[PDB]
Amino acid sequence: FELLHAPATVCGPKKSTNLVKNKCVNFNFNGLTGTGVLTESNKKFLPF
C-alpha cells in the first residue's frame, strides 16, 4: 500500500451518506471537498 506525495486514487468504499439541502454543510463530491449550502439549481450541465 503506497502513499506518496500525490493524489490517493485507490480507495476503500466511502459513498454511504445522505445529501441535505438548504443547510451549511461540509460536502465531499467524488474528491471535491468544500463547505456551503446545497440547493436545487436550473443549470443545464452537459453530460460529461
Binding site: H5, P7, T33
Partner: protein, 48 residues
C-alpha cells in the same frame, strides 16, 4: 471606477487560486496530503 473596483475584487479572488510557490493553491489539499511539520512551510508560503 466601478470597473476598477470589480477588477481589483476579481483579481483578489483569482489570487486565491495562485500557488505562490506552494505545492497546491487549495489549502485543504496541502493540509490533507502533508504532515503538519512539513505542511507548515507550504501553508506559510500560501499564507504569506
Amino acid at each position: 471606477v466601478v470597473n476598477q473596483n470589480a477588477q481589483a475584487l476579481n483579481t483578489l479572488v483569482k489570487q486565491l487560486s495562485s500557488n505562490f510557490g506552494a505545492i497546491s493553491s487549495v489549502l485543504n489539499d496541502i493540509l490533507s496530503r502533508l504532515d503538519p511539520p512539513e505542511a507548515e512551510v507550504q501553508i506559510d508560503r500560501l499564507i504569506t
